[PDB]
Structure 1
Amino acid sequence: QCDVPPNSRFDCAPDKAITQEQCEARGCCYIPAKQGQPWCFFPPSYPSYKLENLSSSEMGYTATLTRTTPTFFPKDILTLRLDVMMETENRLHFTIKDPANRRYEVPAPSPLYSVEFSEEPFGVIVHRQLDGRVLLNTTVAPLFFADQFLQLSTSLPSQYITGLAEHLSPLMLSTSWTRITLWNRDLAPTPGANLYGSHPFYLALEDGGSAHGVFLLNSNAMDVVLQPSPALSWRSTGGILDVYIFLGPEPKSVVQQYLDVVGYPFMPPYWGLGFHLCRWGYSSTAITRQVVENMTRAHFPLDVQWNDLDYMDSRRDFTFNKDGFRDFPAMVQELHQGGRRYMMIVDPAISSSGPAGSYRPYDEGLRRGVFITNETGQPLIGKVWPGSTAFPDFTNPTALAWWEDMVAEFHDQVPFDGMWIDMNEPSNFIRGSEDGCPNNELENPPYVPGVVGGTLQAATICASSHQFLSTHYNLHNLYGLTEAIASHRALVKARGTRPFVISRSTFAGHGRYAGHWTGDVWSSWEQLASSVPEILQFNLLGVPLVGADVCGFLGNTSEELCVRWTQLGAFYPFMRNHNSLLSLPQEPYSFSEPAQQAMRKALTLRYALLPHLYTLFHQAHVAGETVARPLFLEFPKDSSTWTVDHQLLWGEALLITPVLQAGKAEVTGYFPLGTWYDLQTVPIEALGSLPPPPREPAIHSEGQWVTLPAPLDTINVHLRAGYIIPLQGPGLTTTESRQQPMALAVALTKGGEARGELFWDDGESLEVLERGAYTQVIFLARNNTIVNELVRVTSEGAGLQLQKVTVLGVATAPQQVLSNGVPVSNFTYSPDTKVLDICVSLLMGEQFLVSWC
């Protein structure tokens, strides 16, 4: 009865350290590990729920679940309702609820799945129809459903699982008795800790390169325990079990299927993809202007200037100080005149200590009842930057209207172009409130997940505090998401164009409203390497607008780290160099000449690729695609890609192999089966001085590891054969770069074929796709010809000038190159690199044929 294989033992004492006699009193097995693995575990006969009255409906199945024996948790719910909904051929949905009480809820034609049920003990079993593989099997462990403890377990189809943000972790999670805690917490990224966001979704790989996803729509504090059997347990402290299974079968379809439920990523403004520069320490408009002057003088592109707390009067939202920032409005107007945008920090918490009538955000907030309240009905008061603060309740419709007013009124004074929303966990410098927290079951729950500080109140507000929709106990993990939604709506109403919101704290569905940065990362080689897995993870979770503070945030960067960090960072979909108050400068212009050259090249390559990056965001927005994706998403059938997380792809075609260690002049990277062209063979124009010329022009891979030259001034980037990439001429801003002629990079297959596309619009209007205010073009290389295919042509993109076509993998020098049947003014062929470079005078929006032979 206690003869359970060690790796299949499920913990019967997750609540407390337990003696043998207590363990056996619970009706559990006690076998000490020989060296983690639980000593106290469930026998296969431990009491669970019994399935009763299973019935067929027109959507799927309904049943009653009955527990006859209570668990060791208080307030077992002995009668549950099961609903199974076969929603699409790709998406299965099942809920387990209390039929007696409404509980908190987060606000061959054939399906790819089959579902069967275990009667006693109760379990859901989901097979993949095609190969009979078991994806979900909840029979492996008892179902627990108590007022403040849900546990649902399943076998996993392999040792390969990714998701469950936000943690400092490899892309593929360890199944060695790993506890993953989802409780939004302000903490500098460190391993084994709950960080700023919670995404209760995983993607599981199966032998052969199929995959499925599971989403638990639950916003309560929870542990996810992985064991080596392999298996997984969801342990939540409230709500209901609301479970979605996505059948894929391709990993990219899993991600698309998940985003069909939580939302497709928002379309950023084009300028949002340029270079951002920030720090705490730009303590006046004069110093802030000097940053732009210094970047401009050294030929470094800069689209967006930011300010941290510096701009505020006494660290209060919707103010500016009359010392260093007296002429704030004029500074932001000047930035706009020069073709740049402005971003500034906004904190959730609102200063509560000012004299009444002297601070409108608090005075208005108090009048409209916008704030989170405590037991006695008064605003819950914490401590953040301004001192004593109340916290807005972004679940309250009146708070959304108040937020829109405060943003619009401040925007009438200073025309900021977006919002950087920090501290939205929400973060508290004290525990709970100025008045502590009451002694109740929400503040002291029977199961506390493995949160840093061992309490739900640590570095945040009281769990029993009141919000419009529910207690903070249920809503905490949404707080940042609700502010991102509020801020997104505020900016649409204020500016009338696409909003740009960067948020620290996130929940599943965040990407529909805002982007993310990975927070207070150390300026270390370790945190540099760790940023690639984290950026890839947020792309799988539908938050493609993500990056880490380029050169690191905490501590002092070195010159070499900042060169390597700027090289990889130029391939973050969101690229911002941000620096702590206590740190040495790390602006690109503050380094030695050779270091500036390397940094200038990385920024130049990024700006050249912006039309391609923008098109990748269009695909994310319209089809639920990833922008930065791991190799395994593009090559799931090659099991060598599965654990690769120190390389990334942009879309299908661009493979980035960064150096992530000090003292290295080479890097070993994995190259999936196919030809990979070195991007160094494509000509790129820069406004300033670039590094001097130093490698193999093309890598012919069978699926293998390849060592590449990677000197300090180099990052390895390869273009996949069979893809065409649109590029645009240089600029110090996107305002300048968008006016430049465009170029095509055509990577020919062995058979002489390639395909690509360009999406173009005005770069910031709302409702572009619905109004049809865009141009979409496809490029096809075949039989020594390149043509464009006009999917849509409008005023926006009509007069795009194509002036350069670079063809990679051209075997022999051509005797003639034609543009629309006429010999071209000029072309060069390199027999060494096999590159054909062609000057042309064509329009993206007008049919052309370029031919050679």
Structure 2
Amino acid sequence: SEFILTSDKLVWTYDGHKLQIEPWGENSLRVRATVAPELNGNDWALLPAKPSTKVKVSEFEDSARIVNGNISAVVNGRGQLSFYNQNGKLLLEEYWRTRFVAGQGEDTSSKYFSPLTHEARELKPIQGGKFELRARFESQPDERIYGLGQYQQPFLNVKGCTMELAQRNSQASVPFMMSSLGYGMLWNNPAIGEVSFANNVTTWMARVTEQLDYWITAADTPAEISQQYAAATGAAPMLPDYAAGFWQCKLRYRTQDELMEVAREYKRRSLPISVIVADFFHWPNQGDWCFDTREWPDPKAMIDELKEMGIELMVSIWPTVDNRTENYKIMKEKGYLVKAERGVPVTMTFLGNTTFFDATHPGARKYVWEQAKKNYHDLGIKIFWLDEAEPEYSVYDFENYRYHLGPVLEVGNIYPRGYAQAFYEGMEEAGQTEIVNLLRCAWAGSQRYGALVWSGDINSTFGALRNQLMAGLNMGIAGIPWWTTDIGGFDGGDINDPAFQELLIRWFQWGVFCPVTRLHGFRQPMEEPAETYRDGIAQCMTGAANEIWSYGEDNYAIMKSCLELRERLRPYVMRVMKAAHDTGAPVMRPLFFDFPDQAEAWQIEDQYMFGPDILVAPVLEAGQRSRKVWLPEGCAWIDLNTGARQNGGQWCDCDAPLEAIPVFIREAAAVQAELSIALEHH
């Protein structure tokens, strides 16, 4: 084996395998490995690193070492790699089980000595092709793991869980993890695959790839890790003011008159409303990207009236292009569409045979943006709903599809980032600042393209609500601070069912304390279109009403006070949004983000912090009217609902009537006054 060492780079080589470790931001290292002649030029989610001045490269015995601030990497003579912090504590070590490695006998006194023959950096050649990559690391008994994106599962800590590295409706792979051991790690590789944080071994897998690529950072607090990650992959922009208010939506307002009636009724009742939404199939065909003027006769007039009312319109964008449209003909000519490797050249069959635009193709991004610009942005629409962002193949046979940047197996997970990029870059070029679009999916770095992500088409149950809480917290840790849900869930809520009405209330109450407060759903009983087809184009149904007055008088009163509460929170929300932009901190965050020195903060998964000053303890079960709440040590807490003061460092058997969830304010935080919390003496 051979080291090639310079003052700021460590390369190890043996039999064509090249391992390269280098600084990539303060307290951070990038790690690449290949068996090709050279590393390629793909940086994926990593921005160019601002240089590190005090990088120390050294050799000792048969080993080499690279130190960059609070992280160091050691590679021994056998090419085996481990990472340490400034205190010499082991952060992460490769998993090797061999008797012979890098042309040398393995040391029989090591746990690495084994006839099993597993390598830590397995670049397994695909016959005729590239490589199937497994990167193996030792599991650690104390290790708790967070981030990875948005998964539909009741686990905040994902140690012992296995996550698919793929994009499907209601899932988002954003592969940055944060460890309780004091490091964060980005898997800087958009290949379809899997990460297993199994108790016995950690394995990251890429189905098809040219090389291993990851980024690792070390710091004493979660806040510092989140900041270092945002410096590596990009900060969220500043959120525009309107986005902190109430977003009203449903599947679907079918006509201009129907949408405007709802907007006007909100104003007629003196209710807060910042954003109203025209959902999908408001267009003539998929891939036209314009209003159908039979249902939407004068969209400019709608937008102008809504502006006068203080309301922004957001419109559904679908990435689908129906093969009967004019844009299909042009986009096919130009090579701007995704391709099927085998079988009929159709990627989705929903209400027509469509092909997704290729969001990895720079030309296709520009083309789609310029259509949305002409037909929507030029009329005054400032927010786009980038739906189906995965994209939602009718069948998730990732092997069967190919993009501009290569087979979906190799590059597929970056699609939603390109989709966000198309609109963000277009809107920025058109002169807009503080851009936010609603994205169903993301990859590493999507935050830099103003991606407000929502958790997609989940069912309307308490089980779903519990999953969304974990998912949103993990999305924030993965560097996606702008995140939300369909208040009430998407599918299955009957507006006349008491059981659903109870869920809607609990979900709405939680929603007040989400980064964005957004009511959406496909409510029952659903209504079929008058005509199944029109001119051969299949017509889209609607669900039932989904406004805060649609669920009876008692529920209206609760939701109205939720809206009023959210308006009072807006100044605080904007401060926390500014902090996300400045520091990479999430908006909704696990307890350990603000209280990393407290053991309960690393164990509790049903409470969180909404910024630094609000402790939230959602009600996640039907019929529940009280719950246990841990109040962190280090300050006093003001009960939002009673005005009562409680000392930190204790548990509360807290009241949780249907009318409110337990919420506490850090005593004397500016937000306490902004909420007008008072206690009356009767």
The TM-score bracket by the shorter chain reads 0.7 to 0.9
* Pairing partner for 2:3 from 54, 58, 62: 54
Alpha-carbon separation, structure 1, partners of 2:269 and 2:551 = 11
TM-superposition CA deviations, 1:67-88 (whole Å, max 9, x none): xxxxxxxxxxxx2111111344
Alpha-carbon separation, structure 1, partners of 2:674 and 2:191 = 49
Alpha-carbon separation, structure 2, partners of 1:134 and 1:400 = 40
- Equivalent position SS for 1:523: coil
Q: Which residue of 1 aligns with 2:150?
A: 166
Which residue identity does 1:564 align to in structure 2? R
Is the Cα contact below 8 Å between 1:145 and 1:151 reproduced in 2? yes
TM-superposition CA deviations, 1:613-635 (whole Å, max 9, x none): 11111111122121111101111
- Equivalent position SS for 2:390: coil
Cα distance 1:643–1:161, how it changes in 2: closer, same or farther (>3 A)?
same
What is the CA distance between 1:367 and its match in structure 2?
Answer: 4.6
**Highest CA radius of gyration, 1 or 2?**
1
Q: Please list, as runs of the form range in 1=range in 2, the aligned pairs for 1:617-656 lying within 5 A after superposition.
A: 617-656=577-616
Cα distance 1:375–1:135, how it changes in 2: closer, same or farther (>3 A)?
closer
Q: Does 1:153 align with 2:136?
A: yes
TM-superposition CA deviations, 1:75-121 (whole Å, max 9, x none): xxxx21111113445112211023426668353x772123222334x
* Pairing partner for 2:423 from 487, 490, 514: 487
Which residue identity does 1:136 align to in structure 2? E
Which residue identity does 2:443 align to in structure 1? F
What is the CA distance between 1:722 and its match in structure 2?
Answer: 5.1
What is the CA distance between 1:394 and its match in structure 2?
Answer: 2.6
Alpha-carbon separation, structure 1, partners of 2:608 and 2:564 = 19
- Name the stretch that deviates more: 365-374 or 473-482: 365-374
Is the Cα contact below 8 Å between 2:24 and 2:30 reproduced in 1? yes
* Pairing partner for 2:260 from 285, 289, 292: 289
Alpha-carbon separation, structure 1, partners of 2:517 and 2:8 = 45
What is the CA distance between 1:148 and its match in structure 2?
Answer: 3.1
What is the CA distance between 1:386 and its match in structure 2?
Answer: 5.1
Alpha-carbon separation, structure 2, partners of 1:617 and 1:243 = 28
Alpha-carbon separation, structure 2, partners of 1:92 and 1:316 = 43
Is the Cα contact below 8 Å between 1:631 and 1:648 reproduced in 2? yes
Which residue identity does 2:438 align to in structure 1? I
- Equivalent position SS for 2:491: coil
Alpha-carbon separation, structure 2, partners of 1:723 and 1:677 = 10
What is the CA distance between 1:696 and its match in structure 2?
Answer: 6.8
Which residue identity does 1:346 align to in structure 2? I
Q: Which residue of 2 aligns with 1:709?
A: 655
* Pairing partner for 2:512 from 570, 579, 587: 570
TM-superposition CA deviations, 1:615-656 (whole Å, max 9, x none): 111111122121111101111111111122221212211111
Q: Please list, as runs of the form range in 1=range in 2, the aligned pairs for 1:62-73 lying within 5 A after superposition.
A: 62-66=11-15
What is the CA distance between 1:515 and its match in structure 2?
Answer: 1.2
- Equivalent position SS for 1:590: coil
Alpha-carbon separation, structure 2, partners of 1:542 and 1:87 = 17
In the alignment, structure 1 segments of 5+ residues that lack a partner are 1-51, 67-78, 190-194, 432-452, 682-694, 727-742, 746-805, 809-828, 834-853
Cα distance 1:495–1:595, how it changes in 2: closer, same or farther (>3 A)?
farther
What is the CA distance between 1:160 and its match in structure 2?
Answer: 0.9
TM-superposition CA deviations, 1:28-48 (whole Å, max 9, x none): xxxxxxxxxxxxxxxxxxxxx
Percent of aligned pairs with the same amino acid: 23
Q: Which residue of 2 aligns with 1:128?
A: 85
TM-superposition CA deviations, 1:123-164 (whole Å, max 9, x none): 211122315334333446513112331111112442311122
Is the Cα contact below 8 Å between 2:282 and 2:291 reproduced in 1? yes
What is the CA distance between 1:281 and its match in structure 2?
Answer: 3.0
- Equivalent position SS for 1:560: helix
What is the CA distance between 1:379 and its match in structure 2?
Answer: 11
Q: Please list, as runs of the form range in 1=range in 2, the aligned pairs for 1:92-131 lying within 5 A after superposition.
A: 92-100=29-37, 105-107=42-44, 111-120=69-78, 122-131=79-88
TM-superposition CA deviations, 1:332-370 (whole Å, max 9, x none): 22111211100011011112224xxxx3x3344245432
Alpha-carbon separation, structure 2, partners of 1:89 and 1:480 = 28
Which residue identity does 1:212 align to in structure 2? Y
Q: Please list, as runs of the form range in 1=range in 2, the aligned pairs for 1:307-322 lying within 5 A after superposition.
A: 307-322=278-293
Q: Which residue of 1 aligns with 2:368?
A: 403
Alpha-carbon separation, structure 2, partners of 1:154 and 1:99 = 23
Q: Does 1:233 align with 2:203?
A: yes
Alpha-carbon separation, structure 2, partners of 1:456 and 1:264 = 30
Q: Does 1:219 align with 2:190?
A: yes
Alpha-carbon separation, structure 2, partners of 1:203 and 1:412 = 38
Tell me the C-alpha RMSD between the 2 structures.
Answer: 2.7
Alpha-carbon separation, structure 2, partners of 1:241 and 1:328 = 49
Which residue identity does 1:396 align to in structure 2? H
Q: Please list, as runs of the form range in 1=range in 2, the aligned pairs for 1:433-832 lying within 5 A after superposition.
A: 455-457=397-399, 462-463=400-401, 465-467=402-404, 469-494=405-430, 496-513=432-449, 514-556=451-493, 558-580=500-522, 582=526, 583-680=543-640, 695=642, 697-702=644-649, 704-721=650-667, 723-725=669-671, 744=674
Alpha-carbon separation, structure 1, partners of 2:214 and 2:378 = 47
* Pairing partner for 2:319 from 339, 348, 357: 348
Alpha-carbon separation, structure 2, partners of 1:265 and 1:413 = 25
Which residue identity does 1:328 align to in structure 2? P
Alpha-carbon separation, structure 2, partners of 1:680 and 1:671 = 13
Q: Does 1:371 align with 2:337?
A: yes
What is the CA distance between 1:320 and its match in structure 2?
Answer: 2.0
Q: State the aligned residue count.
A: 609
TM-superposition CA deviations, 1:382-417 (whole Å, max 9, x none): 334452223222333322331232122112674322
Q: Which residue of 2 aligns with 1:812?
A: none
Alpha-carbon separation, structure 2, partners of 1:128 and 1:156 = 17
Which residue identity does 1:145 align to in structure 2? L
Which residue identity does 1:404 align to in structure 2? W
Is the Cα contact below 8 Å between 2:390 and 2:441 reproduced in 1? yes
* Pairing partner for 2:176 from 198, 201, 210: 201
